[PDB]
Every structure is written in C-alpha cells, then in structure tokens.
Amino acid sequence: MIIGNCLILKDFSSEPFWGAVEIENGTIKRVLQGEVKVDLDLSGKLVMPALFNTHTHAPMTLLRGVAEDLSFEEWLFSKVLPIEDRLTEKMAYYGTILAQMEMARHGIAGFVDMYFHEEWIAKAVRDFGMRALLTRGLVDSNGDDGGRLEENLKLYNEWNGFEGRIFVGFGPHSPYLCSEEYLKRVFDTAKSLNAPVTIHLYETSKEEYDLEDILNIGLKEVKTIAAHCVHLPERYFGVLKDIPFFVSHNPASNLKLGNGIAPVQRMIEHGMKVTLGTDGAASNNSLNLFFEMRLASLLQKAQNPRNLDVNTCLKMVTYDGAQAMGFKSGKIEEGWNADLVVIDLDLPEMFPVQNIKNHLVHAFSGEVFATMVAGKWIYFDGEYPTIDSEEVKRELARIEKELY
Ligand code: MET
Ligand code: NI
C-alpha cells in the first residue's frame, strides 16, 4: 500500500517533506519523495511515526473518574482495590478494547501494561490490533504472592511473541509492595527468560530506600521500564545511563496524586533514557500521549524555558518508547515497522504551517486523523475498522450497570 502526496516526518530530528510511504507485509518498503502515484492521497495532512505509551493499566478505563480528590494511599486502598475486586475477565477485555479505542485516537500504536486478567487484556490487544508489552502486577507478603508470578508465567508461555505485536514481561508493583526477597526472585525470573521488568519506582516521597539493593539483583542486566522516578536520587543518574533502564515519565498522574514533578531534564542531561506513560485512567483519566508529552515539556520549562525542546519531546514519545518496548518503530525508514499516524494540518492550531513540529508539541489538540500498526488501520477518520463499535459500546454500557 502506498500512502502519500502529503507532508512526511521521518523522525524526531527530521524536517517535514512532501512525499509518500510504501508499506508491505507490515513494514516500510521505501520512502518516496515528491509527487508520486499513491493508493491513498492524504494531501493536506501529515504522516509521522506512531506513539508508544510506556505505562498504563488498561482496564482502568472502567474506573475513569471514580477516585478523585484523594491522596495516593486513599486512592489505592480505599477506592480502587474494592472496585478491582469486582472487575471480571470479560470486563478486562472490554476495558482494554476501550483503552485502545482512546489511545488509537491519539496516535498510540503500542503500550506497556501492568495489571491482572492479563490473558483477556492480551485477547483484546490481539483483536484490536495494537502492539503491547504486557505484564502481570506482582505483590507479595513474605514471599507469598497468591500465585501472581505463576499467572505472569502462564501469560508469557501463551502470549510472548504473538504476531510480533505482543511481548510479555514481569510487573512487580514497587519496591515497597514487593519484599526484597520476592523482588529478587522476580528479577531472577525475568533475567532467566530474557524478559523485561516494569515497576513503579520512587513514585512517592515516602520512598527513601537505596537503589543499590535493586542494582545488585539484576537491574543492570534486565531491561527495566521504571515508571515515575519522581523521587529518584540524582546520585544514581550516572549509573543508570549505561544500562537498559528506561524511565516512564507519567506527568499527569504525578501531579494528580500529589507526588510532584520528576526531574526529567536532569535525567536526560545525564544520558538517561526517558519515555512517556499515561498510567491508568483513574489517576489521569485520559490516555493521550500527546497531552502527556506537552505537559512534560511545560513542567520542565517551569525551571528553564529551554528545557525539553520539541525534538526531544517527539523522540521520547516515538522512538524511545518503541525502544523501551523492544519494537523496531519510531522512524519512517526502510525495514522499520509500519506503525504510523496521520494528523490533519487543516486545523487552526496547526498554523503557521512553517512551524508544524512545534505545533505537534505545544498546540496540537491530540486528536489524530488515523493510526496504523503493522500496516493495518486501527483508527481512521473517527472509526475503528478492527472492531464492532456498536457491539463494544453496548457491552460497555452493560458493564457500567454491572460494575456500579
Ligand atoms: C497493577 S496490578 C497490582 C496488583 C493487584 N492490586 C492485585 O491484587 O493483583
Ligand atoms: Ni501505575
């Protein structure tokens, strides 16, 4: 398939140019320049790499707006846990379909998940069309995890590598909900299976433990997506630079739950790899990485207007996120995955046209025209070609009545 006759943004460091993109077998066969014969004329629009959300809890879309004006401890143990106790397998599936509907409308091609009923979340990802690194949330009590690691292993056995779109990793919740012995066991397991780990790290100010413990259990040799890192001591930035450590910056959630602002600019200046995540819809309420990216840029600029430039922001939301997830995406080049997004330039916020890249970060509404993954359209002009919208909406309505 050849889509083009419009502006093309190869990557975060490139300039938009008029051309087209030829896709075959889910990959980019070649990038054409200028006036060329195309199958799909997208004149008046922009084609760029798709985005990658490095932190979420997909089914939480079913809890959007249920836990407001609460501190973290109240949010989790008072409001969220009781409701999650009623969240069924069927609900996990549809909640994930809903999460993908929302994320796809914002140009997201893949996401990293940490939750339960992960097999049904995987089925939803399979059916909808996105890519994903799925992990099971792990917590324990003196080594007893109620079978959570076992469930994560079942998930791995059945879904890791599925269609080159789904990968499986391990999701220890945090260094405080996981005992030291158990966290070590989780890392040993991930290391043995050469699988990634994702965890909430230094999200709250109460977390004052030393990172040496985790640095000696496998953090150096296991690809780890560390969400938040708001209170991560700067003395560790240097050692985290040359290891497969990816920060997942969740600005909205960090503010909403009163945790603060992560020192992203300093982390980047130290050579650390940083990506963007949304967290769940109950503590952000939106699953929009454009919003997340923009907010991130603004928060760092509070200290210095030169912080987080446009190219760096675009790099984090596309290439860096794909890198964290282990996918050859984030750039429109030959041999790379056909994960692309189309943005309408015929909008007030996209003028002057000579500043398109800047608008993507500081003005763009966030609503894309279309999203493609593996060469397939998962969102196009307000519609979801891979699912039965009416059916899904009816099921979601029944779920709201059933859950609440
Ligand atoms: C993000 S899932 C965290 C663990 C979950 N609360 C459980 O009890 O399994
Ligand atoms: Ni989270």
Side-chain angles (χ1 to χ4, degrees):
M1 183 188 284
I2 302 177
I3 61 172
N5 194 198
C6 65
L7 288 179
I8 307 297
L9 179 63
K10 284 195 172 184
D11 59 60
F12 60 85
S13 69
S14 305
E15 301 301 322
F17 69 86
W18 199 277
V21 182
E22 176 167 48
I23 301 101
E24 189 178 7
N25 298 310
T27 62
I28 302 174
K29 191 174 182 180
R30 58 182 296 182
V31 185
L32 305 171
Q33 294 178 296
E35 297 300 301
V36 190
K37 179 180 180 179
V38 298
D39 295 312
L40 176 63
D41 167 55
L42 298 173
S43 61
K45 296 177 175 57
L46 171 74
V47 174
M48 64 176 286
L51 290 59
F52 294 81
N53 182 178
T54 60
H55 186 65
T56 193
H57 308 285
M60 297 198 83
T61 51
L62 302 179
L63 280 66
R64 198 195 312 277
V66 307
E68 304 300 318
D69 304 344
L70 294 173
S71 62
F72 174 56
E73 287 81 0
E74 297 170 275
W75 184 91
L76 180 58
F77 304 99
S78 179
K79 283 285 183 175
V80 173
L81 289 185
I83 300 168
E84 296 187 328
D85 231 306
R86 308 198 301 281
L87 202 152
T88 66
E89 290 176 338
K90 185 200 69 176
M91 288 181 194
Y93 175 91
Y94 285 108
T96 299
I97 290 296
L98 178 58
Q100 289 172 285
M101 287 169 70
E102 176 174 12
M103 292 188 286
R105 195 178 194 173
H106 298 125
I108 291 168
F111 65 97
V112 177
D113 203 64
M114 181 201 287
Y115 216 55
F116 51 95
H117 287 156
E118 283 303 316
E119 287 168 48
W120 295 86
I121 291 172
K123 290 174 181 173
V125 172
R126 169 190 67 193
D127 299 348
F128 193 92
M130 279 198 184
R131 294 192 193 278
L133 169 56
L134 304 178
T135 78
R136 207 278 183 224
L138 313 175
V139 293
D140 77 308
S141 180
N142 292 306
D144 189 337
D145 73 351
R148 292 177 177 79
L149 180 59
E150 184 192 278
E151 288 179 12
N152 203 327
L153 290 158
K154 186 177 181 293
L155 174 69
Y156 185 88
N157 176 80
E158 311 170 326
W159 294 95
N160 189 62
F162 182 76
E163 285 181 19
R165 294 187 310 194
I166 298 177
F167 277 130
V168 176
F170 298 82
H173 179 278
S174 58
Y176 61 86
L177 289 195
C178 284
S179 66
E180 175 160 46
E181 328 306 298
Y182 183 69
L183 189 58
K184 181 177 184 298
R185 181 184 178 206
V186 173
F187 268 98
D188 291 332
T189 304
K191 197 166 64 187
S192 293
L193 292 172
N194 299 311
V197 165
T198 190
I199 180 170
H200 294 119
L201 193 70
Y202 292 112
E203 177 176 16
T204 68
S205 62
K206 294 174 176 295
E207 298 169 68
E208 307 181 65
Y209 45 74
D210 289 311
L211 193 57
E212 277 77 2
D213 298 314
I214 304 175
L215 279 163
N216 295 311
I217 62 175
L219 191 68
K220 296 182 182 178
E221 34 191 358
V222 171
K223 184 174 69 172
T224 304
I225 296 179
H228 307 306
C229 292
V230 180
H231 302 278
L232 168 65
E234 186 176 307
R235 64 173 181 280
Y236 297 118
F237 294 0
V239 301
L240 298 174
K241 168 190 176 182
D242 300 307
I243 56 172
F245 185 86
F246 291 83
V247 171
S248 180
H249 177 45
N250 288 243
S253 180
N254 292 167
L255 292 179
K256 199 155 184 284
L257 294 177
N259 288 313
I261 303 172
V264 174
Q265 181 66 26
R266 303 213 62 176
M267 289 177 202
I268 294 174
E269 298 177 327
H270 278 68
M272 288 172 68
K273 293 172 288 293
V274 186
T275 64
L276 289 156
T278 58
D279 215 354
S283 74
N284 186 319
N285 304 40
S286 80
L287 301 181
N288 179 347
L289 223 62
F290 272 100
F291 175 77
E292 224 54 46
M293 176 182 68
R294 181 175 179 194
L295 177 62
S297 186
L298 291 171
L299 295 173
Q300 295 307 300
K301 290 183 180 304
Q303 306 305 308
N304 188 321
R306 276 159 151 44
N307 288 173
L308 279 192
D309 57 43
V310 170
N311 286 7
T312 300
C313 287
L314 292 175
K315 180 172 181 289
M316 291 192 282
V317 80
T318 56
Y319 178 77
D320 295 337
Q323 285 282 120
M325 291 181 68
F327 292 115
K328 188 180 179 62
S329 304
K331 294 186 176 182
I332 303 179
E333 295 188 301
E334 291 183 53
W336 291 62
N337 292 324
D339 300 346
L340 312 163
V341 292
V342 184
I343 297 169
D344 197 335
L345 300 179
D346 208 318
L347 300 199
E349 51 267 46
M350 301 304 295
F351 179 91
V353 304
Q354 64 194 70
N355 298 318
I356 296 302
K357 291 187 71 173
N358 293 338
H359 304 326
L360 293 174
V361 179
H362 299 293
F364 178 47
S365 69
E367 298 291 63
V368 306
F369 179 73
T371 302
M372 169 186 281
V373 166
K376 194 154 190 168
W377 295 114
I378 62 166
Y379 181 64
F380 197 102
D381 189 40
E383 299 183 301
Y384 303 102
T386 70
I387 56 170
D388 190 325
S389 300
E390 295 198 7
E391 179 61 54
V392 177
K393 297 181 184 300
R394 303 196 204 86
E395 296 281 40
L396 287 172
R398 297 161 187 156
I399 290 176
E400 192 178 329
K401 308 172 192 175
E402 167 182 39
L403 186 59
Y404 306 104

